[PDB]
Amino acid sequence: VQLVESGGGLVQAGGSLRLSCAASGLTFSKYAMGWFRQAPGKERKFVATISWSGDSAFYADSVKGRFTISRDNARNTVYLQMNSLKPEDTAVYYCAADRGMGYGDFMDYWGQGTSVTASS
Amino acid sequence: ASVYAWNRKRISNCVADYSVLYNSASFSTFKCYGVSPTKLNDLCFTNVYA
Ligand SMILES: *[C@@H]1O[C@H](CO)[C@@H](O)[C@H](O)[C@H]1NC(C)=O
Numbered sequence A: 001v002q003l004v005e006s007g008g009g010l011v012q013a014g015g016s017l018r019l020s021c022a023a024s025g026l027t028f029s030k031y032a033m034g035w036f037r038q039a040p041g042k043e044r045k046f047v048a049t050i051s052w053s054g055d056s057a058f059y060a061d062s063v064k065g066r067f068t069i070s071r072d073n074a075r076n077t078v079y080l081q082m083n084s085l086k087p088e089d090t091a092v093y094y095c096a097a098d099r100g101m102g103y104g105d106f107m108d109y110w111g112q113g114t115s116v117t118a119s120s
Numbered sequence B: 001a002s003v004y005a006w007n008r009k010r011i012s013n014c015v016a017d018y019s020v021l022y023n024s025a026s027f028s029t030f031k032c033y034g035v036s037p038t039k040l041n042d043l044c045f046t047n048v049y050a
Helices: none
Strands: A017-023 A032-038 A044-050 A057-059 A067-072 A077-082 A091-098 A114-116
Touching (some): A032 A067, A044 A067, A077 A091
Antiparallel strands (some): A017 A077, A032 A044, A067 A077
């Protein structure tokens, strides 16, 4: 029931960026976790998703080499690292969970969405 | 078709390299049950009527 987004893209210069969500309403090793984003004008698009227990991970065609969807089975937390920040990554991000293997427009639990944006 | 008069064709005896889906990057609710998306490529059964 609890899946909250925090952090931001409040960057005065380019660099490594982190997002720190927490899953503290239900289990986190059963509900396959996910991470989506809605650009300011562009729709909710897939960013990353994880398996049930974190055993399988894959990304999109433009975020795979510069992202890190890190989950935490213990201590109830989850992070998304964004590396080599680019202007094509302006969005509001959501941590998510579902009974499948993430990757669903409608999840089991939906994040609030923190604004991450890269400006150079 | 729809959910009230859906058809069930035979899905076997034909090449199915489901990696042809994994470069899609346009789906919304790709989910897989009894199998992960990855491990339905190395092993995948017959009688897989779609
Ligand atoms: C269907 O179209 C999408 C995008 O146009 C593509 O990613 C997918 O591979 C296509 N599938 C088949 C079976 O043609």
